[PDB]
Amino acid sequence: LDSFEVEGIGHNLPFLSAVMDHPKFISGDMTTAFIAEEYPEGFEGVNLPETDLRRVAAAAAAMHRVAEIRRTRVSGRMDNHERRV
Amino acid sequence: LEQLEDRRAAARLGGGQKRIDAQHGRGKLTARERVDLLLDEGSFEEFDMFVTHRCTDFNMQDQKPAGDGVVTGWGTINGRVVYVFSQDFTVLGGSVSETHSKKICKIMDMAMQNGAPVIGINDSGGARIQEGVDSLAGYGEVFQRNIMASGVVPQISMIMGPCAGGAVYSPAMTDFIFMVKDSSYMFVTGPDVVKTVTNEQVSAEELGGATTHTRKSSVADAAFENDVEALAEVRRLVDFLPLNNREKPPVRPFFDDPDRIEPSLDTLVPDNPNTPYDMKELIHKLADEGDFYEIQEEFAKNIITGFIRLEGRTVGVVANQPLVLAGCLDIDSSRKAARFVRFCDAFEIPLLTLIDVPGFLPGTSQEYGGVIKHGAKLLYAYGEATVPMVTVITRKAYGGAYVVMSSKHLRADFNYAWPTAEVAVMGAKGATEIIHRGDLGDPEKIAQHTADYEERFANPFVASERGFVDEVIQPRSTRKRVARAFASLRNKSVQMPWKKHDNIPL
Amino acid sequence: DIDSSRKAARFVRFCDAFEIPLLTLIDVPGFLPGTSQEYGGVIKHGAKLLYAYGEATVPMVTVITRKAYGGAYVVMSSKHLRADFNYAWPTAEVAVMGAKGATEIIHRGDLGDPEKIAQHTADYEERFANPFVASERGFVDEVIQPRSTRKRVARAFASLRNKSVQMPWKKHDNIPL
Ligand SMILES: *C(=O)CCCC[C@@H]1SC[C@@H]2NC(=O)N[C@@H]21
């Protein structure tokens, strides 16, 4: 799912991802009312746990620098005074 | 001397810690904090930090702050030199005086002598009344400078507070005007005078707020959410611009392929001709890393103007939007693209024009409004432009509009066409009613006459037989066709007849 | 003086004729007094260095370390000769003339009172012999900490590598000889 990319329409990709991470789905202890019990208010979105936010933080931070360094390689910069990331 | 350090730090305080809070109170950053986020971390060199005004009227000489209301100097953006001035609202309202302007002129004069853009951060209460004509003269020297530099070195104006009176006319003449969503505004005459003379009661935000200007007046190029993104987006903009009219668009690395194919494109033009599509989809797919910095997005939405890169180089783009007014050309869409084209040309930025216009927007409102003149502006712009010009007609290219949209008669270089293109004098229907008068009383003749004009002229091939369309291509390959088309024009050099200047309609 | 002037004057012109930038370090009191100088023509030779900076269009950076008084002040790549960066050390003193002489001119009816003039001078000194009045005016782009000069000047020149300035068209100049 994480790699399934869809653009242009509204879809349930995030919702599916959500239930795949839902403990009860994980424990197998599910009934036919599961959907109705666990998502009574529709799909309220998903939100990452510390150790998740943490890993993501680091990745974005890592990627951002990469991109930032590239802005630095613009032609026409002061010879000995380039931007330092 | 640590005395120096004190004076320095004293100056840095502006109108004082109490006012600094007031400012922050309005969600507005300080003059210096704005400068701090604009320029490459620690690369700002300040000038005229201890400048004091020369006023003597109205006891003005008892309040002689350091800096006199504006922070000027230079620095770099991604290592490239840029000149800047940020008005310090906390100091005598960042009111313009003889000396406040002088400071701005010093770096404008420096930007020009060294070929580097000028970023203006306006956040001023307006002229310094006590100075009298000296405040007027103050403006004058800025204006003059603003004018001489037009199209010689990029002038990006940032409005982050009030901007009233003569003042507006400066940013007016710069190449870009960005505003900060709620904390900024600008108008020649104040709401209070609008009352006493129009009996109309309106609030500053209504009169000249970020929204009013980004979508009603045609004055601002974008309204940013707040001071921080405002500053961030400006550097983003600067990363595309050349440093002056001598060098060409900057170059940089690019993790994308000039030969990328977007098959999705092959079905972008809907079958039904009455169904729009978003011209912007195309733009993103063609654009390098899908990055598209849009100018005047929220205005004249029937046309799109923006910047993108290709093979890591800057390319300006003007394209019709079916989603609005059916991609019609109109006074405003015209004024909006016309200037964009001219700025891009004045600065050697190539143009990619994506076409799907039906004609111009009909109406008494348009004619009485002078489309004859405004409409021509865009035409004038492409006629004058000499940078490399590549065009791709996705669908509709009828009549006058067809010609205006970077046609081959305006000496564009590449005039590409998707098979769904239809270039013709006017629609099959109207065409028929004119060509076949004595046949209207026979609704099957005209029903058939149209069906023939349609089958014989609504396409790109008659134009191809003529050479007007250099080639008809498969939509998916556009990115590939256009990229190398420009690549091959990097050396383009064309000469317009000598003249002091143009006389384009106003 | 005549000679120092002729000596620097040519140096400047050569460096300019050949796109070499100029760094001018200042601490001049004024010109050297004397019948020898005037009869020798300082009016003309003195001018040469002035002419040189006035004409020069390469990037010009300046740092006044201490004294910058009167005419000489102007001649030493002042901002009025269109130099680009006019830096100053805190120990800089830019003024019409020394506090003393200044005082005797501004306060005539006050000499017979050796305490008035002793005080009048002590004020001119305290109020004008420094770089700050010139700062308020903009004639000194900045006052810097001596230690950082190398840093200041280096980047100042760096940002001027693209400088391009035009003098009016002419077959050639008519500099004094
Ligand atoms: C169909 O409903 C009648 C044709 C309407 C004409 C349209 S409106 C805008 C286009 N430009 C133009 O002058 N005619 C086209």
Ligand SMILES: *C(=O)CCCC[C@@H]1SC[C@@H]2NC(=O)N[C@@H]21
């Ligand atoms: C002591 O102050 C005696 C007067 C000396 C004046 C000095 S000598 C060189 C300087 N230039 C000038 O014309 N007078 C200054």
